[PDB]
Design a protein around this ligand. Structure first.
Ligand SMILES: NC(=O)C1=CN([C@@H]2O[C@H](COP(=O)(O)OP(=O)(O)OC[C@H]3O[C@@H](n4cnc5c(N)ncnc54)[C@H](OP(=O)(O)O)[C@@H]3O)[C@@H](O)[C@H]2O)C=CC1
Ligand SMILES: [Ca+2]
Length: 159
């Protein structure tokens, strides 16, 4: 099963100049808990933004060109990316915008963090069809001393 995990600010903004333009440690804990011990697929720009493999996860990088780092597994197509994960219960697609768009039609689950932040961005999550998805988990949190925005963790399953 293929899942997408993403954090979305107002208007589905996910990124600006190769970063996530907000401060939300609660989302790091959610991301780690839901990706650890699962393979993660990401695009080259997202890979370049992290600089080092995510520990405890098989890191698969999509790029049309030959790989440049043997600490991760490089693939040249969506189907090769999926194949490189082998037979696992759940594959996690972790971004960015262009990768999310291509995996959305193949995904059965979305893990979304909806962040109440107004941010300018140059990257947005795809415009998913709400009727195709059932919300199976939704937990809202107010801002606190560590998290400067309110946020809501949501899991949606494809109907
Ligand atoms: N808010 C969030 O949850 C997250 C946000 N982000 C943000 O997303 C942004 C990056 O997204 P974006 O610019 O769209 O880039 P991506 O991270 O999606 O990487 C795009 C690159 O991946 C490669 N690629 C993608 N699809 C394929 C394919 N089918 N075959 C071969 N190679 C492929 C290409 O590399 P090549 O050019 O080498 O061919 C392409 O240029 C950043 O701002 C980042 O901070 C990232 C992850 C999470
Ligand atoms: Ca806010």
């Amino acid at each position: 099963m293929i899942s997408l995990i993403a954090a979305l600010a107002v208007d589905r903004v996910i990124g600006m100049e190769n970063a996530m333009p907000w401060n939300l440690p609660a989302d790091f804990a959610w991301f780690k808990r839901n990706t650890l011990n699962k393979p993660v697929i990401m695009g080259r720009h997202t890979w370049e933004s992290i600089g080092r493999p995510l520990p405890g996860r098989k890191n698969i990088i999509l790029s049309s060109q030959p790989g440049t780092d043997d600490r991760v597994t490089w693939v040249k197509s969506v189907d090769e990316a999926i194949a490189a994960c082998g037979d696992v219960p759940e594959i996690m697609v972790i971004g960015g915008g262009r990768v999310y768009e291509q995996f959305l039609p193949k995904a059965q689950k979305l893990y979304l963090t909806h962040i109440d932040a107004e941010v300018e961005g140059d990257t947005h999550f795809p415009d998913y069809e709400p009727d195709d998805w059932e919300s199976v988990f939704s937990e809202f949190h107010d801002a606190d001393a560590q998290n400067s925005h309110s946020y809501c963790f949501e899991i949606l399953e494809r109907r």
